[PDB]
Design a protein around this ligand. Structure first.
Ligand SMILES: [K+]
Ligand SMILES: [K+]
Ligand SMILES: [Mg+2]
Ligand SMILES: [Mg+2]
Ligand SMILES: [Mg+2]
Ligand SMILES: [Mg+2]
Ligand SMILES: [Mg+2]
Ligand SMILES: [Mg+2]
Ligand SMILES: [Mg+2]
Lengths: 118, 167, 131, 122, 200
RNA sequence: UCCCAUUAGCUUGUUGGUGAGGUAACGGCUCACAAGGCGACGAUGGGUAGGGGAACUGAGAGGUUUAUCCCCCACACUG
RNA sequence: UCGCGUGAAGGAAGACAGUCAAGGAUUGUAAACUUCUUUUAUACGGGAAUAACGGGCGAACGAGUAUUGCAUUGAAUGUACCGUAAGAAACAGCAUCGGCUAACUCUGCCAGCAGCCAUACGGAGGAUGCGAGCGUUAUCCGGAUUUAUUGGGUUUAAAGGGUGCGUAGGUUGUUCGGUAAGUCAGCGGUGAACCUGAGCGCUCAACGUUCAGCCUGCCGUUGAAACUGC
RNA sequence: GCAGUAAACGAUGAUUACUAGGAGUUUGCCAAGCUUCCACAGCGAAAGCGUUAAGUAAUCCACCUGGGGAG
RNA sequence: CACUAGGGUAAACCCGGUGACUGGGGCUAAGUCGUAACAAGGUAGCCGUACCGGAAGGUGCGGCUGGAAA
């Protein structure tokens, strides 16, 4: 079936993934129907770039994401039923405010004194 | 056709460059007679440039005679800044040369006789090609006549009778 | 006759090389347009159209620089010959003598020079180079 | 030619030929020496050059010049043949690689050692 | 690789003491070898261009491949090719340290950089070919601010007169203002010859 | 979309029609009137080769090759 | 392919090699003082791993949160301390082209060419390229315009058919009016990685990655009528 | 009746238009249409060509791509 | 019972190899016999064609100047 997955595209020791929509029988780094984003797991904030409208369209027509692609989609907020609501409308989830959650955690800096009095 | 110039006593900036030294032979009953011929290009780093051939029995004497003849035979070339107004092709004997203006930071893309001629005339931005024989006499003369056939926009407007040809 | 435009250019070139002052050519519409373009650009001193019983005669008076005894025209070159026709767009219009010459070109808006052809954004057949 | 003539026929280009065709585009070849003999140079040169008739693995006969001072080559010796032609010698367009297979390095060499397969002196 | 050979040989061969000031350059102004100071055979223009290129390379401690890449960079960059080449040569980290006066010679600066006594923007950088950009801060590492050699080199260097370098002795650091002009650079290298040699 | 004319004629399901059968599907795809079809704008035959994007190279035009990478095709000891 | 090291700053003209009493190797060596990139030994040691599964919470199924466990590489990055210049430079040239010089030997040889049997052969001393490489061979491209549309020629250098008629084909005086095949213009569609300006990350760099600038071919559809075609 | 070659040569393919002067010469009325020698510009490596071009241009055909082997 | 891979048979074609014997060519030296060409090369040279000679060559017929002398 049509799938949403990642193609490994960096170099040795530095993995960079291209989030694509591809047929399941295609080679891992080969043919793909469409490209919808990129994923850099080396950075601690775990850099993600995604095309929201196209990802939502592919989920709507029924592309099956892999585990990591599904996690990325959930983190970006594609996985929602706000459009599924048949009894409500204009249901602003506003969960992006909580999903910001800026983790500005740093490390204290210490120095060694140079006691070379000679 | 050549602009020409009198002995440049005031314009005494004429640096002299050497193109080629040849040891020609003449045969007689006693044996062989050897001489030396030098091609000398004098230039003031401006449109003034001259060429001469000096023949003697010694290299310094040949070079001096070439310098004298080059000083006697002088012309003026319409060069603006360090480039040439337009492209120009020329032929002289078996030598054919082609010069094209280039960008400001390009230098001189030529070697040998053409490079010596261009240095003497003070052109520092040009692409030059030789599509014939590499003879020094003919190469020097063909390059000089290519330079002499040039025309600046002012001269083009002058002999066309108009002022601005959308330049 | 195989190329009347090339013949007209050759007549002009031979008259210039010989040093004549007036050259007479058989007349044609495209040749009249070329003569008008030459007069407008300032390459020839004057011209006159004579309508006799034949197709007519174009009489061209050439322009010489009295200061230097040099004709206003130096090179005339036919580009699009019958054996090899050449058409260009307005983007790829040729530039003659680094913009110091002209390229007579026939366009759907008429016969003009490459400068106004580029200005009006029209291409066509490159008749000749003049400088 | 005219444009119509070129349309009808066109132009022809001819590929060049290898200067050392018996190598078959291989940089070197293995061979067996048939006869190790001595030859005379052309008119302006006088010497006694050492040449070998070599049968390559691709079943080709070549004349290979043995360089350096002295050699240990005999008949039925396995040698390595590379390209390169000697000017005065006619018909000798190959060289024997010294210091490989049966042929050894030139003894007593100190300069240009790598061209004659001589190990670095201790 | 590094040259790591005798320096007075190169100094005498080129005349100019490019490695600083030495007592050997006096009473000896001939190229090394038994054929020195035997007049001066006419060297060609190509030989002069080659000797200028070698002078630049021995001055800045750069090998031929890196020098060719630097010339390619200058050609790609916008400006005068020779001036850009000299600016790129002077923008190297070891040269910047030497101009800041942390080390007496360019080789001493390179040794300090390699042995990790120099910090760039607060982080240890040990590549001697590192290209310093204007606005960056190059200073002594905090763990080696009391080195005897560094202290001696800075002793008497209270001038710090280079216009394109701002020195702060309190922080034991310095900053680069802008790329100096070729006339401001105090090197006798004729970059024009190198340019024509590498372009022809 | 490669060379050879020291390869000039090739073709009898072959070109078209009627009908039937068959196939996922149109069709001489197969099976039971007419003589047509293709050919110096190179048919037929012979030789050679997997084809592109890349890559390299050159100012450009162009040239070389498809090793690694991607797309399409062909094949799995021989039928 | 890229990057780094094989030490840094002082030190007079030792010994031994070469040339001519003095040049040169040479501040080179030996001495004395700093440093430890990198080897060696010890210790701390990431990131590549994010969801899992099992608990919840708004409710009728999907999602949204909170947790446990999960690293082949792996004593690899990085960090820190011992004591140490210690463990780390070769290869090809040196008669002209071409950057580099003199002695001792002598057919042996060398060789890209001019050619040399000695500023060219072999060794010694020096010098010059490059440098963890340096040379040789093989193959391809450019200069090479030596297949020339761009961009060559044919009296004598290679090159006009012995001469005509003529089939196909190629080219077509002048003018008026149509058409729109060639030609010109507008709009739309289509055309990973690599390659070009700007960034960002690899301590730099190769490289990786993002974005702006190429789409300059093909197809469809609207107009123009100077030129070629009909 | 075959054969189909030559220093079968102007060692120079056929058309069209244009561009200086001199000296001769054949033909029908100064002037064509020819047929021969010096010679401007221009061309050419030069010898040379130069209105009967090897000059200036356009159309089409033939032919060349180092020598020998080898027609 | 058709259909067919494969088998045998014959032919003819194409592609290769080898063979008693018998012919050119290239290259290297120079043994042998002459002197054909280059000067009017001692009979001007060359082109085509025919006949003939140990060989370069000779002669006949027509042509050309890429020949002196005149
Ligand atoms: K017409
Ligand atoms: K005849
Ligand atoms: Mg390296
Ligand atoms: Mg000939
Ligand atoms: Mg003829
Ligand atoms: Mg003939
Ligand atoms: Mg004779
Ligand atoms: Mg005779
Ligand atoms: Mg007889």
């Amino acid at each position: 079936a049509t799938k949403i997955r990642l193609q490994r595209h960096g170099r040795k020791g530095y993995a960079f993934y291209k989030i694509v929509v591809a047929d399941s029988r295609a080679p891992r780094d080969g043919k793909f129907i469409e490209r919808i984003g990129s994923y850099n797991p080396n950075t601690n904030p775990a850099t993600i770039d995604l095309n929201f409208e196209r990802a939502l369209y592919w989920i709507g027509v029924g592309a099956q994401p892999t585990d990591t692609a599904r996690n990325i989609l959930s983190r970006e907020g594609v996985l929602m039923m706000k459009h599924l609501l048949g009894g409500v409308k204009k249901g602003a989830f506003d969960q992006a405010a909580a999903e910001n959650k800026f983790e500005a955690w740093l490390k204290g800096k210490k120095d060694a004194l140079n006691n070379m009095k000679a | 056709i050549v602009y020409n110039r009198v002995k440049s006593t005031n314009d005494l900036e004429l640096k002299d460059r050497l193109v080629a030294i040849n040891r020609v032979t003449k045969v007689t009953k006693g044996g062989r007679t050897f001489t030396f011929a030098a091609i000398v290009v004098v230039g003031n780093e401006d449109g003034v440039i001259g060429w001469g051939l000096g023949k003697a029995g010694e290299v310094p004497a040949a070079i001096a005679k070439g310098v004298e003849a080059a000083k006697k035979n002088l012309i003026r070339v319409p060069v603006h800044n360090g480039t040439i107004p337009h492209e120009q092709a020329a032929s002289y004997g078996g030598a054919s040369v082609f010069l094209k203006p280039a960008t400001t930071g390009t230098g001189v893309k030529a070697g040998g006789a053409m490079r010596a001629v261009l240095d003497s005339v003070g052109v520092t931005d040009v692409l030059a090609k030789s599509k014939g024989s590499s003879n020094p006499h003919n190469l020097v003369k063909a390059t000089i006549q290519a330079l002499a056939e040039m025309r600046s926009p002012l001269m083009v407007a002058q002999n066309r009778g108009i002022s601005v040809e959308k330049v | 006759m195989t190329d009347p435009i090339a013949d007209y250019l050759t007549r002009l070139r031979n008259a210039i090389m010989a040093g004549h002052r007036v050259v007479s050519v058989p007349a044609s519409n495209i040749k009249k347009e070329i003569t008008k373009i030459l007069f407008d650009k300032g390459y020839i001193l004057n011209y006159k159209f004579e309508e006799n019983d034949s197709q007519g005669i174009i009489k061209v008076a050439l322009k010489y620089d009295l200061a230097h005894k040099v004709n206003a025209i130096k090179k005339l070159k036919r580009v699009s010959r019958p054996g090899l026709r050449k058409y260009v767009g307005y983007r790829d219009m040729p530039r003659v003598l680094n913009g110091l010459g002209i390229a007579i070109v026939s366009t759907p808006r008429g016969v003009m020079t490459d400068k106004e052809a580029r200005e009006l954004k029209v291409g066509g057949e490159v008749l000749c180079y003049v400088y | 030619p005219t444009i119509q003539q070129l349309v009808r026929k066109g132009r022809e280009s001819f590929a060049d030929k290898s200067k050392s065709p018996a190598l078959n585009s291989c940089p070197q070849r293995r061979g067996v020496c048939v006869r190790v003999y001595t030859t005379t140079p052309k008119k302006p040169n006088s010497a006694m050059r050492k040449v070998a008739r070599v049968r390559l693995t691709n079943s080709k006969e070549v004349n290979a010049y043995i360089p350096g001072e002295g050699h240990n080559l005999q008949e039925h010796s396995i040698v390595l043949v590379r390209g390169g032609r000697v000017k005065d010698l006619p018909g000798v367009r190959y060289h024997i690689v010294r210091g490989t297979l049966d042929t050894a390095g030139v003894n007593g060499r100190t300069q240009r050692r790598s061209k004659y397969g001589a190990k670095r002196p201790k | 690789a590094r040259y790591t050979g005798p320096k007075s040989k190169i100094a005498r061969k080129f005349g100019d003491p490019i490695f600083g000031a030495d007592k050997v350059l006096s009473k000896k102004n001939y190229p090394p070898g038994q054929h020195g100071n035997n007049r001066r055979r006419k060297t060609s223009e190509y030989g002069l261009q080659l000797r200028e290129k070698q002078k630049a390379k021995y001055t800045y401690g750069v090998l031929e491949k890196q020098f060719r890449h630097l010339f390619h960079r200058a050609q790609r960059a916008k400006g005068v090719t020779g001036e850009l080449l000299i600016q790129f040569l002077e923008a190297r980290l070891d040269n910047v340290v030497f101009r800041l006066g942390i080390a007496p010679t360019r080789s001493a600066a390179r040794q300090l950089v390699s042995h990790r006594h120099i910090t760039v923007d607060g982080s240890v950088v040990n590549i001697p070919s590192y290209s310093v950009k204007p606005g960056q801060v190059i200073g002594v590492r905090e763990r080696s601010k009391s080195l005897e050699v560094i202290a001696d080199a800075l002793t008497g260097f209270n001038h710090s007169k280079y216009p394109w370098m701002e020195w702060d002795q309190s922080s034991l650091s310095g900053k680069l203002l802008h790329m100096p002009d070729r006339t401001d650079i105090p090197e006798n290298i004729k970059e024009q010859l190198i340019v024509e040699l590498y372009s022809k």
